[PDB]
């Protein structure tokens, strides 16, 4: 069924909360035993959001390999993503270790450091060129190279240096700064504009490691981003674009991280973004 007609059907019958609960009921349940070990309690921002064991990213260190992060590998679309929580004061060094070890080119941040008067993640990148950051636990240095502030998002060029070997890499930081404190955006236009800027940079392409995407818990706004990207790519690849089933794609992604898309409003917004984004992938 054309999602656009599916959309109006659900909208006129006001059944979004019902569709969404059906997804929650059918979603995969896999063990997350490593996340729950006592030694890792201060590595998790939220007690009820954990990576599954089978898909978790392992840090390359004998001490403790745990980070709250998951590899979402989409086989038909030929795209991979790493979804992670916003880094905590004691996990910022682990976060940049993962970026280095997984050979990522881009980091996508979908939250502000403070929202609703509370801290939603650590200030984990430098704000001034001349004030670089050193992460002593993982032996990495991080420098701000340039900053381009736009109305709906900011793009930063960063230099990550492995102090052990003195190799350096350019990392691109894509910061969507205008998601509202409550609810979802009224129009998907600025979100789609942002997605296409990430695509244009190379950060999603198979020559690099997977993009790292986060919000506060790494499941809500973050799920919306990868769900929309993968659905649009499938519509590009297939002979029959109306065969793309957004609910089935979401359940496939939930095999790799729990709780992706956190509200029925985020589900509706994901439909809106794919429907409106389609009106480019087909030529215009």
Binding-site annotation, residues for substrate = 181, 215-221, 262
Is the alpha carbon torsion for 135, 141, 143, 149 positive or negative? negative
| Start-to-end CA span in the chain (Å) | 23
188/275 Cα distance (integer angstroms): 10
Method used to solve the structure: X-ray
Q: How far is CA 66 from the centre of its chain?
A: 19
231/249 Cα distance (integer angstroms): 7
Cα angle 212, 217, 223 (rounded to 5 degrees) comes to 60
179/221 Cα distance (integer angstroms): 9
- Closest C-alpha among 75, 209, 61, 72 to residue 135: 61
Cα angle 103, 204, 181 (rounded to 5 degrees) comes to 105
Is the alpha carbon torsion for 214, 98, 35, 248 positive or negative? positive
Range of the domain at 110: 1-284
Listed in sequence order, the residues at least 6 apart from 246 whose beta carbon sits closer than 8 Å to its beta carbon are 3, 227, 231, 270, 271, 274
Look up 121 and say whether it is catalytic: no
Distances in whole angstroms, Cα of residue 229 to Cα of each of 78, 105, 166, 248, 267: 12, 17, 35, 14, 14
- Angle, helices 189-200 vs 221-237, to 10°: value is 70
122/90 Cα distance (integer angstroms): 9
Listed in sequence order, the residues at least 6 apart from 134 whose beta carbon sits closer than 8 Å to its beta carbon are 140, 141, 142, 163
Could you identify the residue written with the tokens 């019958």?
Answer: 13
- Closest C-alpha among 248, 226, 242, 247 to residue 282: 242
Count of positions (residues) in the chain:
284
- Closest C-alpha among 270, 259, 267, 274 to residue 18: 267
Confirm if 133 and 142 have CB atoms less than 8 A apart. yes
Q: How far is CA 47 from the centre of its chain?
A: 19
Alpha helices in the chain (DSSP H): 3-12, 16-26, 92-101, 189-200, 221-237, 246-253, 264-281
Number of structural domains (the chain) is: 1
Could you identify the residue written with the tokens 């959309």?
Answer: 7
Selecting among 121, 215, 226, 231, the annotated active-site residue is 215
């Amino acid at each position: 069924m054309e999602m656009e007609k599916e959309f109006e059907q659900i909208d006129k019958s006001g059944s979004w909360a019902a569709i969404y609960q059906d997804i929650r009921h059918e979603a995969s349940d896999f063990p997350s035993r490593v996340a729950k070990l006592p030694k890792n309690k201060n590595r998790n921002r939220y007690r009820d959001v954990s990576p599954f064991d089978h898909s978790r990213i392992k840090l390359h260190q004998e001490d403790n390999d745990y980070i709250n992060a998951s590899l979402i590998k989409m086989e038909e679309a030929q795209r991979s993503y790493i979804l992670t929580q916003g880094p905590l004061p004691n996990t910022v060094g682990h976060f940049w270790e993962m970026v280095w070890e997984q050979k990522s080119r881009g980091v996508v941040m979908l939250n502000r450091v403070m929202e609703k008067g509370s801290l939603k993640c650590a200030q984990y990148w430098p704000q001034k060129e001349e004030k670089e950051m050193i992460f002593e636990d993982t032996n990495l240095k991080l420098t701000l190279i340039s900053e381009d502030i736009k109305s709906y998002y900011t793009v930063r060029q960063l230099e990550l240096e492995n102090l052990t070997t003195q190799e350096t890499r350019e990392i691109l930081h894509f910061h969507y700064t205008t998601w509202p404190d409550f609810g979802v955006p009224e129009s998907p236009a600025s979100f789609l504009n942002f997605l296409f800027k990430v695509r244009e940079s190379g950060s999603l392409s198979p020559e690099h490691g997977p993009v790292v995407v986060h919000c506060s818990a790494g499941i809500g706004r973050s799920g919306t981003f990868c769900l929309a990207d993968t659905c649009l790519l499938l519509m590009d690849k297939r002979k029959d674009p109306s065969s793309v089933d957004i609910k089935k794609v979401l359940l496939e992604m939930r095999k790799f991280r729990m709780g992706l898309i956190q509200t029925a409003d985020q589900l509706r917004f994901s439909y809106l973004a794919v429907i409106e984004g389609a009106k480019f992938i087909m030529g215009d």
